[PDB]
Structures are given as structure tokens and as C-alpha cells.
Assembly symmetry: C3
Homo-oligomer: 243 residues x 3
């Protein structure tokens, strides 16, 4: 692939060289390898989380009694695990022969933690089997170990899917890059009060922006549209996970 | 381009190998070839289809008398054909010498049909010359043949542009991949009632999300912004196609 | 990278060959080189410019007395220059060794001008040091020279960042391509009156759509979300640039 021509940046003013941590360099390589290997499409959707939010906030007592903080992330992890089982092509990878998908029968999900040294994506194993306060505890632990460089490379392996949440900082939507060999990554941005037509008038609903990027070789437009539609449906009423 | 390292997925749990149809493999190759060849940009726009929708629904009698279903797709195909003639760089392809555009003087448009075996994009020839009930009939036929594997490879050729509609499933917008050697593809998502400022107050208008991806080597930002603006203008009042 | 198969386009109808200006061909090459080199992510945000707009319009007298037109572009250039200093990783480039960032201590910003011959991106040097009417005058001059082929290649060099504004034509958002070796580009689309929840009811605020594409090897999701959040914050109240 043609390289970018070097420029003498100091011809234009003062420059300074800072170096990249080995973590950034690793990260840089993996993103570039994914970019050139995966033809990316991003499907955008918004989910009504007004009732989910009310639930979160009411269970503040129980979560503190348990010592966990219950954010949107365990609710997101539980719903994507239910969906990764319903729509199995999202829980799979392209076999190196280019002619088979390896469908995984397990659901481990990674989530992006941005640390000073670079991006880490710890993996919670068997998300489909853990409860909201279990995933809350564990997500929190893995993030603290990630920040404190105590995350062992074992916990960075064998994910089937990645959630990347930037809702705590800002933004309306973004187009994340698939962590190949996974086949999809869910970006989540900031929730806002939005007018939503109730058939007769506009009601304020709290809306969560979702950005699903996927590997278009494995997932086609209709399948990905159906995945963010079911996810918006499960987040609007998380009780559907019970049936 | 650096390959993705193989992972032993069975170290993490049970896996299963399903194979890809030849159609998926073909599709996989073509998308990857487009991805690496076309520097992609997506221009997003929303079009007011309140009046278009009213028209569609009122002509339900005539369409049933004709045996056709009149969806948004023939209305979309007629407007893009008028525009492909107004803005001819969208109806062209980059010559293999890298230094000429081949402007096509015909308008054939493909539309994406997602079938079990994979994606098919049948082509309606000379969309600029057919009427809304003619394109309605023909689109329906080609889709049935596509699903029923009776679509002959002849009808999959020589398109100038592609419409990919996922409005029947969901989503707010997506970033489609250009089917090279074409130079653009229109993605269409779900219509929603939206408040739109009338100069004095917010009126509910039915808004259609449009996502134009284009080949930035051939089309620059201003030209693509002008294309989705004219398309939003023609869909808001389809009578402008008459003049 | 696998080439696109040639098609005999004349099998389908009349075709015509128009040639590409040398400018388009140069442009075509540079975009393709960026595309294959930079793993791109776009972060979308909206900024409340109601008060900025009021200010613009009230200073119409002063700007005309000075002979300049004061558009949104000098306001945008001043805010990104303040931010390029606050968040220095956006004002830097990846060193050819792949293992260092060259942080620039100067702020020169380019802006996209679409001319008949192709795209030109003139550079205003030391944007951080010039005033709103100075940047207004200079932006206007450079654009006229760009259109009139009088722009000397000197003024097309050593930019740290690019603003690409299509707000004067249309669109809701787009995904621009990073001009490598820069690490980010801000796309700006059309402002619309939008309902924005004031804690109790929806107020019409004039909202500007921002689309920040970045080089994900150098900038991670949280940093880019923080950059468009600070930019939305500075545009909502440009007086924060004074402190």
C-alpha cells in the first residue's frame, strides 16, 4: 500500500517528539490490520431507555448494598448476550479458509477501557450466565485492573463481541472499528431527551444512540438492521430477556 | 495487506463450523475489493416524505387494479434517475487508466435484495423511461426471481447506481459500501415522525433518512451534498420531476 | 490490492469519455493513500450556535466597515485553534518510524475549497494569533485565489488540521477523510432549528452538525469524544476562549 510521504514539520515552526507506549503501537497495528481486512459498515439506531433508566436509578439501594455501581454497561452486556444467542452469525468468526464461519457456542464480551497507556479491552466470560449485579462487579474490577496495569493477558482473550461506550464523555454517534477476528462492535454514545411521536404528540423520551459497525463479508445490511432493532426493543423493555 | 492471525476458538468453548454459500463468498470478495479500492465518504440527509406518503397511500386503489404494490422504492428509483441525468458525474465510472471518467448516457439502477443465499442486486434498465407502476411491477418481479434463484446473471449487469433500502427493518442511517465500478450507492432507512421547525413552531413531518456513500476520487464533498439536497427536494415534491 | 475488473460499459448503452484534470488525479491519489493508511473513525456531535449566530449577525456592521464577510468559518477556525492547543495530540503527526508522534507547537489550519478543477485546501498560518476579522479577510482572499488558480503551492503547505464546511449546501453529517499526515479533519454541515430539552420543555435551539474524522492509531475514542464535546462547549459560548 503506498506510504505517506515524510514532511519536514519543523519547516513550519517548532516541533517536539513524544514517543508512543508499546501499548499504543500494538493498538496501532491491530487497528490498521482490521481496517484493511474488514469492509466496514456502521448501522445507527436509537433505543428508548426511559424505563431502563428509571430501573437503574431505583436499584441504587440494592447495588450499593452489594458494593457495585450499576451503570448502563451491565444492562447493555446482558442484552447483547441474549441477542448474540438469538442471532448467532454475530457470535461467529470467518474461518481462515475464507469459506466457513466458526460459530461460537459461548458468549464472552469485551468492553473498551481507555487508560493512559492506551486502549485495553478486558473480556467478561459467559456474560449470558451472569446477573446484572455480577456483571456490574466484574466489569468494575476488570476496569480497575486495566487502569492499574494489573490486567493479565489471559483476561484480554477470546471475546466474541466488543461494546465501546463513550456515553460518559459525549457525542451523538461514531463509527467504531471491528476488532477482527470478531465480526461486530457496538458503539454507545450520550443519551439525550428527545421528542418522540406518540401517534398524537411529541413525548420526551430518553434516547440512547447505538452505532453497530460490522464485517460486511459475514453480515449483510438486513441482518445488522435487525440486530440494532432487536437491541433497541430489548433495551426499551428488558423484561423481554425473561421469556 | 497483513492477515489476521488465526485463533484457536475452541480454547474458549464449544464452536461449530458452518460453511459459506458460493454467493456469500463471491459477495465477500467483491466488498473487500471495493473497500480497498474506493476511498469512501457517506453524506447523510433527511427528506420530508409526508406528501409523498399521502400520495402513495391514496394510489393504493390504482396500484391494486394494476396488480402492483406501490412502495417507496419506485418513487426513489424515479427520483434518482431524474437526478442521475441532472448531475452526470454520479452516473459515470473511473476509466481503468485512472485519468478519465466514462459518463454513461443510460440510467440502469440496481437495488439490493437480501436472500438466504446472500445479497443479489438486480438491475432495472432505463429507469428514466418507465413509469411508477411499471417500475413497481418490475421491481417486484426481479425480487421474486432473486429469492427463488431464478435471476439470470444478465439482469445483474451494467447498473450505474445502487439503492439499498432497509427502511422495512429499522435503523436511523448506515454507511453502505459502493459497488465498484459504480461511483455511489444510496442507503435508505426507516421513516419517523420528526419535529421540523416551520419558522414559528415545530410541525410533525414524516422524515426519510438517506445515506449516500460515494467514491471520493470521482465525487467531492460539495457535489455529494448537492446530490442529497436535490434528492430531498425532489422527494418532498415529486411533481418537480415533471418540469 | 486486487484491482476492479474492467467492464465494457458501452454494452449497455451510449457512453462518453471525459478526462480528469491533473488536480483531480492528484486529489484521487492522495485520498486513496490516506484511506489505505489511516484507520478512520468519525465522531459526530452537535453544537448549539444560537448565541454565536446572533453575535455573527449583530457584527454585520463592523465586518462590512472592515470589508470582510464574517461567516461561521473564522469562528470555527478560532475555536479549533484554541482546542488544538488544549488537546495537543490533535495537533501532531505520526513520525515515519511508527513509534513517535511529532507534536507541532504551531497551529496552521487548512480549509477545503471546492473549485471547478478540483479540491484545494489553502492553509491559514498561526490561526491562534489572528482575530476574527483577520481570519475573515484572509480566508476570503485565499478562497478567491484558489478559485482563480492563483494559489501558490506555498499556501497549500504545513497545515496541522483541516476544516471542511458543507453547511452552505446541505446535509446532516458526513464522514470526511483525514488528509494524512494530519491526524484529524472536522466536517461541518447545515444548521437547523432543533428542539432541545431544557429540563422541562423543548426549546428551539439552532444546532450545528460536526463530524470529526480521526486517525485511530494516534487518537482513541475517548479523546475524540472529548474534542467534539469541548468544541460544542466553546461554540455555545465563544467567550470561554477569552479565559
Amino acid at each position: 500500500i503506498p506510504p505517506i510521504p515524510p514532511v519536514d514539520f519543523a519547516k513550519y515552526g517548532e516541533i517536539e517528539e513524544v514517543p508512543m507506549t508499546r501499548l499504543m503501537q500494538i493498538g496501532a497495528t491491530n487497528l490498521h490490520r482490521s481496517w484493511l481486512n474488514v469492509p466496514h459498515v456502521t448501522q445507527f439506531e436509537s433505543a428508548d431507555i426511559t424505563e431502563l433508566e428509571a430501573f437503574r436509578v431505583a436499584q441504587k439501594a440494592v447495588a450499593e448494598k452489594a458494593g457495585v455501581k450499576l451503570t448502563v454497561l451491565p444492562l447493555l452486556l446482558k442484552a447483547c448476550a441474549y441477542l448474540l444467542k438469538e442471532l448467532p452469525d454475530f457470535n461467529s468468526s470467518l474461518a481462515p479458509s475464507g469459506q466457513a464461519l466458526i460459530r461460537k457456542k459461548y458468549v464472552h464480551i469485551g468492553f473498551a477501557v481507555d487508560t493512559p497507556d492506551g486502549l485495553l479491552v478486558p473480556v467478561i466470560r459467559n456474560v449470558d450466565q451472569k446477573s446484572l449485579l455480577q456483571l456490574a462487579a466484574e466489569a468494575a474490577e476488570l476496569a480497575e485492573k486495566a487502569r492499574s496495569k494489573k490486567l493479565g493477558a489471559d483476561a484480554m482473550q477470546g471475546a466474541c463481541f466488543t461494546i465501546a461506550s463513550l456515553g460518559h464523555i459525549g457525542g451523538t454517534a461514531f463509527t467504531p472499528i471491528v476488532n477482527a477476528p470478531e465480526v461486530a462492535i457496538l458503539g454507545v454514545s450520550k443519551a439525550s431527551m428527545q421528542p418522540v411521536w406518540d401517534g398524537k404528540a411529541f413525548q420526551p423520551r430518553l434516547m440512547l444512540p447505538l452505532s453497530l459497525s460490522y464485517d460486511h463479508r459475514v453480515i449483510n445490511g438486513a441482518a445488522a438492521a435487525r440486530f440494532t432493532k432487536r437491541l433497541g426493543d430489548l433495551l426499551a423493555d428488558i423484561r423481554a430477556i425473561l421469556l
